[PDB]
Amino acid sequence: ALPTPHEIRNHLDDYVIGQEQAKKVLAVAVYNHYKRLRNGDTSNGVELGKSNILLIGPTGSGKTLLAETLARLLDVPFTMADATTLTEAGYVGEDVENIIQKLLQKSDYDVQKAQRGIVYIDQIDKISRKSDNPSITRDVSGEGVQQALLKLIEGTVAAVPPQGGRKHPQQEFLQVDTSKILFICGGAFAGLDKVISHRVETGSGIGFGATVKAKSDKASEGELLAQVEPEDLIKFGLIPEFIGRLPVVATLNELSEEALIQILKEPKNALTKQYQALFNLEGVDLEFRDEALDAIAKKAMARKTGARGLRSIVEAALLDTMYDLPSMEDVEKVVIDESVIDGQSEPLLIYG
Amino acid sequence: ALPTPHEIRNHLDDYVIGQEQAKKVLAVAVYNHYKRLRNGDTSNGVELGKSNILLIGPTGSGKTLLAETLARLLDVPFTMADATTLTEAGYVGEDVENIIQKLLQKSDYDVQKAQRGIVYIDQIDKISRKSDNPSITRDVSGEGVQQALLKLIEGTVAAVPPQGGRKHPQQEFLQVDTSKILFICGGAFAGLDKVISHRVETGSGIGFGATVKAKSDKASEGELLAQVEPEDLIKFGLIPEFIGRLPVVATLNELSEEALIQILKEPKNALTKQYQALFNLEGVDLEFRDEALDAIAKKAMARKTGARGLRSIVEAALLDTMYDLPSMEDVEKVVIDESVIDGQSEPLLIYG
Ligand SMILES: Nc1ncnc2c1ncn2[C@@H]1O[C@H](COP(=O)(O)OP(=O)(O)OP(O)(O)=S)[C@@H](O)[C@H]1O
Ligand SMILES: Nc1ncnc2c1ncn2[C@@H]1O[C@H](COP(=O)(O)OP(=O)(O)OP(O)(O)=S)[C@@H](O)[C@H]1O
């Protein structure tokens, strides 16, 4: 039998933590993709639709991580492309058809197996139209890319040189349908919080009757993105014709103080396990007490960079120890204290 | 015997609703095409004239749907091209002649059967200029594409490599007339409403006598587009020469509230029938009461995206059900209430 949403979600939970609603969206799409793939116009119903996904969230929230972990468990082909390196059908940078070419490399040029594949795009915000730009210009990077992707997300056939061709002799191209291919676009949008505030609060009134902002901190990013709608993205720069192709939307909440503590212990590829393996080959053990982990959470959130801004807190601390650890000998275990993170103390070394 | 406008329309009515004005235009065109085709280049009126079509409508109004349904009932060959990949002067992206060679794939390289074919182009607004000025730089994906299409829509013979050729020795091309070929170039224009508003509004004086904008919602997109003329498209960026080749114009209206309710039940490919088939294979039925659909219609128009942005509403509510439905057993029927769409309530489930 095929997988289940609870089973596929249980697998992603091993590699991803603190994203409940986001994992549900991907499970239903993947679980539903196998159904549409298994019965293509072989049931009472016909003209089976499609529902792409648009992932939105802050930096270091786990958007790019879900696509990578999904490829491990996914059977059908999967790719991880980008939108920054695309041009508008003819310029020197790149064409949209390169995405389909990368899919065939993993599918071994199996057209029947490539149409049933999944596609992922990262950094979609980088192709967002600048709301007030000079009218006499052409946005090949941002407007052109969206315009080109319109027919792709809907379904069409695109010429793809198989293997690049030996020489001019062949001069042929392969047709690859895209009506059944899924697309998972995602990218951290910048400045979107400001747009929703103008529409939602509708205040900022210096007068008496108008209600002034109670505090400096308001409109929580996690709670603000939840109130997103397609009309908000139009003011951002995206075209409604493009967003209509991606009905589903997923709002990822930012990291929490308790979530960061679990990311270092529960996952298998956590940074603590990475450094533990870094010293394991060196014949040296490692320790990370909970009294130090909770302290690191406050340091990371202050950076406002996300989970990816955590190595700066760890490597800045262990820089001194790693520098002189190889020269030192007869050292078996290392102990990390809360004070070391603060920088007022030196980590203890266990001789042996 | 040939089809009729009433007979051909009835077939489109099964797949399209609320587009009576646009349906009559395509019926007369295809009907006149057969009569124009019945005469083997000889009639009382020598050199019969041609009349192309320019479909204009909002986003997700049903333009691409008509071209797809038309090819099913149409006997003569049909193609579904796009103006996104075209580049003039033989650039690396694509050439205009690709449309012709693509048409032969459907006709199996039959010139006499291909000259009587129909052509459809989407995203025609993508190749329009930004201002009335001629240009400031070489606009490959723009006015240059229109200049190349001028000769093609009037009539000429374009070189076409038959089958691509085995190698360089063939070095020949086939000539294919285009004076008799029909062309349906239509795409949702963006920002056209404001351009037309300046022409008909007559300005907005700040004094008493002048007429100010009554409400925020005034001069709807559909009512406004009906007042479109060729001179308005010149300020948009299209050249009058290209517009002269497209005398006919079809103004599609925006989807209404009651129109969306009919689209979910009457059409064969409606979303209600799609999800009904999605659960039919799972041995589970589905229901959608009328009280739930009226609320969904109000939510879709709020998104300002059309019917294509309807899946976002249905997928949000169903998400919870689809996630735990496979794990759940002894479940045969699901009922969706109006409250479920709002999110206050949970969809009722039936066990047995
Ligand atoms: N939920 C999570 N659980 C564990 N680690 C996480 C989680 N979210 C992020 N990380 C860490 O953050 C790293 C990168 O996360 P990403 O998915 O790249 O964030 P991102 O939002 O995709 O970055 P962008 O899209 O380029 S702004 C991962 O390799 C993990 O180390
Ligand atoms: N009149 C209609 N009746 C039923 N479904 C419709 C109708 N119009 C649009 N739809 C739905 O919208 C989908 C896409 O319609 P399209 O033909 O792509 O609209 P559109 O005018 O082409 O929008 P663009 O130009 O591609 S942005 C169809 O597959 C239907 O599901």
Coordinates of C-alpha atoms and ligand atoms in Angstrom, one line a residue, chain A residues 150 154 241-242 245, chain B residues 15-19 57-66 68 120 122-123 186-188 252 255 263 267 269 274 307-308 311, ligand 2:
Chain A
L150 CA 2.4 30.9 -16.0
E154 CA -0.8 25.2 -15.7
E241 CA -2.3 35.5 -12.6
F242 CA 0.8 33.9 -11.1
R245 CA -1.7 29.1 -10.1
Chain B
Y15 CA -17.5 23.1 -19.6
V16 CA -18.1 26.9 -19.4
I17 CA -20.7 29.1 -17.7
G18 CA -21.4 32.8 -17.7
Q19 CA -19.6 33.7 -20.9
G57 CA -10.7 39.2 -19.9
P58 CA -9.8 39.2 -16.2
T59 CA -7.6 36.6 -14.5
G60 CA -9.1 33.1 -14.4
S61 CA -12.1 34.1 -16.4
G62 CA -11.9 31.0 -18.7
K63 CA -9.9 32.0 -21.7
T64 CA -7.5 29.0 -21.6
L65 CA -10.5 26.7 -20.9
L66 CA -12.2 27.6 -24.2
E68 CA -8.9 23.4 -24.6
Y120 CA -4.2 30.1 -30.2
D122 CA -1.8 33.1 -24.7
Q123 CA -0.1 35.9 -22.7
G186 CA -5.7 36.6 -26.2
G187 CA -4.4 37.3 -22.7
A188 CA -5.4 39.0 -19.5
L252 CA -15.2 38.7 -20.9
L255 CA -17.1 36.0 -12.3
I263 CA -19.2 26.2 -11.7
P267 CA -19.4 21.5 -15.0
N269 CA -14.6 19.0 -14.3
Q274 CA -12.9 16.2 -8.5
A307 CA -12.1 30.7 -10.1
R308 CA -8.5 29.6 -10.1
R311 CA -8.9 25.8 -4.4
Ligands
LIG2 N1 -16.5 29.9 -17.0 C1 -15.9 29.0 -16.2 N2 -16.5 27.9 -15.8 C2 -15.9 27.0 -15.1 N3 -14.6 27.0 -14.7 C3 -14.0 28.1 -15.1 C4 -14.5 29.1 -15.8 N4 -13.6 30.1 -16.1 C5 -12.5 29.7 -15.4 N5 -12.7 28.5 -14.8 C6 -11.7 27.7 -14.1 O1 -10.5 28.4 -14.1 C7 -9.5 27.5 -14.7 C8 -8.5 28.3 -15.5 O2 -9.2 29.0 -16.5 P1 -8.5 29.8 -17.6 O3 -9.0 29.6 -19.0 O4 -7.0 29.6 -17.4 O5 -8.8 31.4 -17.3 P2 -7.9 32.4 -18.0 O6 -8.7 33.5 -18.7 O7 -7.0 31.6 -19.0 O8 -6.8 33.1 -17.0 P3 -5.4 33.4 -17.5 O9 -5.4 34.2 -18.8 O10 -4.7 32.0 -17.8 S1 -4.5 34.3 -16.1 C9 -10.2 26.4 -15.4 O11 -9.5 25.2 -15.5 C10 -11.5 26.3 -14.6 O12 -11.2 25.4 -13.5

